[model samples]
Target: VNSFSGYLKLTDNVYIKNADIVEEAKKVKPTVVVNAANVYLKHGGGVAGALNKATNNAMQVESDDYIATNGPLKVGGSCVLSGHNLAKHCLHVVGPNVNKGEDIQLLKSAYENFNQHEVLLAPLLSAGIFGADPIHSLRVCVDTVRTNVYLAVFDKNLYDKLVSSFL
Candidate 1:
């Protein structure tokens, strides 16, 4: 594994770190960990899968219950649940996929939905299998956030690309 550890606080409220979000979420006990989730809250793989593991698969149970209760989430729609063994809570957000014709504001709306949290742990929304541009995701995060947050980056290359924006 690439082992470069870098966390710099560019603002009192903004942090960028090159680390696993799942590890950081456990370490910081963030008020919430935002899940770049699918509409069904399936959490089958990627960040979602890793989070489910950290929570001992209990998070998946909650997600399943949520879907049973409220049906599937719409693009930019979200729901909150217990964080299980990790952060205080979890925000499962269905970010828009560009390939599906969803636009940037959809991603921004997802961030807008999370501003209520004073402290959060997040990843670049929709940048994983959902296909939102990483840099665009980071920029939206910078512009929309209202509280202190640690944007956990797993990829050193992505971290390097995003950290410059904070400077």
Candidate 2:
């Protein structure tokens, strides 16, 4: 078993930590776990893919159906899927593609979509496969979620950087 690493509090409720996103989701047991996806609802890469596998591919089915009927989600727009593995809901948001130069704003907007939930699990938006700056993206994510937010960090370098700056 992995030993319990420490966590850094960004706000009264928001935290950053080096841990498995899926494991943290289970530990924190948030009301919603954010799924960073493209407009096409492809869960074949990055944290989205991990989440897809964790949830038993349920997210893909739900997201695909939602997009099929409701159309592609605009950048920063989001839809909720019933949680299959951990939380009560999965809040899927469309993030900006790499080189868009709109990642931070888009991520901030996506974070704003969670008004009802008290606890939320979020990733470093666009920092993985979408290829945004981790520091900048994380800053935006931390600033946006005023309520209870768990920022999951899978990369050690990024996690160390965030911890050094915030913790």
Candidate 3:
């Protein structure tokens, strides 16, 4: 499994955790806690496993001031449901693969969803999507993050091109 951590600054102290969906959200206690997951899979059995609960939590983020989720919950290749009910954001992450670099496609879709009110957070992992090469995975992740940032900032032209092309 992949892992990541998010830090939220509160009034007095800082909150840190292992990046579990529920734990992370509890740490911030913000108006909302954004979440991103690659896709709905078997191991997504915790709070992330229950769609309705996840959605409720997401709604709570705005309504009650905090939420948690793994984003979209899918069945096999098709998206069966979403984790939240009209959330502020629904970011998706694409795992690496050799045959098709579909990360570009997924990112494009996320960008299109990101009008002005939504936020997106993508993670980088070391190791191939299926293989176990930590070094290569790290390299690909660093490259992906740098390239995405560049395209999002310096290359608005490319950004528009990608969006239009995908859309």
TM-score winner: 1
- Score candidate 2 by lDDT: 0.76
- Model 1: worst 10 consecutive residues (lDDT sum): 1-10
For 74-147, candidate 2 gives per-residue lDDT tens digits of 88888888777777888887767676666456767876775557777778777787877788776776667666
- CA RMSD, predictions in order: 4.1, 3.5, 13.7
Q: Estimate each model's TM-score.
A: 0.89, 0.86, 0.31
What are the per-model numbers of colliding residue pairs? 0, 0, 4
lDDT of each: 0.80, 0.76, 0.30
Model 3 is weakest, by summed lDDT over 10 consecutive residues, at: 146-155
Model number with the top lDDT: 1
Residue-wise lDDT of candidate 1 within 4-119, one digit each (tens)? 23567756566778889898877767778888888888888889988998888898888889889889998887888998877788988878877677876888888886778877
lDDT value, residue 110 of candidate 3: 33
Writing each residue's lDDT as its tens digit, candidate 3 over 1-167 gives 11224332211221212233443333333222323233433224323333225554543343222213444433112222233443333333324333333443333333222222222222222112322233333233333332221111112353233234321
Instruction: Mark the regions of model 2 whose C-alpha exceeds 4 Å error after superposition.
Output: 1-6, 99-104
Q: What's the ranking of the predictions by TM-score, best on top?
A: 1, 2, 3
Between the candidate structures 2 and 3, which one is better when assessed by lDDT?
2
- Residue 150 of model 1 has an lDDT of 74
Assess the local accuracy of residue 52 in candidate 1 as a C-alpha lDDT between 0 and 100: 91
